[PDB]
Every structure is written in structure tokens, then in C-alpha cells.
Amino acid sequence: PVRSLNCTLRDSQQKSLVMSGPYELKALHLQGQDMEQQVVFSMSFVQGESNDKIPVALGLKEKNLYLSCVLKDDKPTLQLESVDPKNYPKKKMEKRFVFNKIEINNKLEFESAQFPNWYISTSQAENMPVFLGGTKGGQDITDFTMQFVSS
Numbered sequence: 001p002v003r004s005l006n007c008t009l010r011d012s013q014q015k016s017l018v019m020s021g022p023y024e025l026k027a028l029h030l031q032g033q034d035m036e037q038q039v040v041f042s043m044s045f046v047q048g049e050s051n052d053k054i055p056v057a058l059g060l061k062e063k064n065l066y067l068s069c070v071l072k073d074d075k076p077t078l079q080l081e082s083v084d085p086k087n088y089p090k091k092k093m094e095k096r097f098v099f100n101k102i103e104i105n106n107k108l109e110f111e112s113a114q115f116p117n118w119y120i121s122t123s124q125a126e127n128m129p130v131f132l133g134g135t136k137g138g139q140d141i142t143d144f145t146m147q148f149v150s151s
């Protein structure tokens, strides 16, 4: 059976991720405000055996949605894809749903398996969408921490 855990994520500047309507996630500082707004992910361990990366899929807990990477105008793009809850999650997830989780300096990166060198990213600015970016180590933020909830 596919192994999965429940968790929340925060970017390296402590912005939490929230659902911004049906089609996207946004990142903002929820300190001082109720953290019940943050998305709870169901991170599943999928097939990819890689050396220093762990292939995972990121589902939105109790919402039938998965983070996916699709090409739009020659640019890899992060989308929320609706799925049949009976068929998901699965050990062999489609490549568009797969992210290679990379541990680096006590933080996590999520690189698209479909589009190498593109990562789950947040802006330094408040309340901007979570997106797939192709720069790392600049202004855009590709480092996260997981707050483990349950297995």
C-alpha cells in the first residue's frame, strides 16, 4: 500500500500556505492570526529508487486535489488537479504529480520530476500564489520546512 503522512509546510521565511479559491494556493505570514487556514497536505511516497531525492506526491487532505506540473506557453506551471478519490493515492503516480523531495541544510525543496530544475516556490511578497519557479537561491523561495501531523 502507498505510504503517506499528513503535514503542513512553511517556506524559509515562515509564510504558511493557504487555499486561494479552487485553482491555487497562496503564501502569507499567519503569525498572530488563526493557523487553521493553512493547507494540510497528504504527502505520499511514490515510485521514481533515487539516490539523494525522495519522489513524493502532494495531495490536499480531504479535498480531492493534487499539486501537478503542466507546461503552459513553454513554461512549467503548478496547478491543482481534481482526481477520483477511489483511484488516489497510488504507488505509481503520473509524472505530472511527482516531486523529488530534496533535503538541503535542514530544509526541503520539491523539484518537479516532470520538469527538472523547476521547484515549488513562493514569492518574498505576502499573499502571492505558490508557483513553479526555475530559479533557486535568489529572491524566490524554494526552501520549506514540514510540520509533521500524522502518518
Ligand SMILES: *Cc1ccc(-c2cc(C(=O)O)cn3cc(C(=O)N4CCN(S(=O)(=O)c5ccccc5)CC[C@H]4C(=O)NCCN4CCOCC4)nc23)cc1C(F)(F)F
Residues within 6 Å of the ligand: 005, 054, 101, 103, 104, 105, 106, 107, 108, 144, 145, 146, 147, 148, 149, 151
Ligand atoms: C522527508 C521526510 C519524510 C518524513 C519525515 C517524518 C516521518 C515521521 C514518521 O514516519 O513517523 C515522523 N516525522 C516527524 C517529523 C518531524 O518531527 N518534523 C518534520 C521534519 N522537519 S523539517 O521538514 O523541518 C526537516 C527537513 C529536513 C531535514 C531536517 C528537518 C523537522 C520538523 C519536525 C516537526 O514536525 N516538528 C513539529 C513539532 N511541533 C511542536 C509544537 O507543536 C507542534 C509540533 N518528520 C517526520 C521527515 C522527513 C524530513 F523532512 F526529511 F525530515
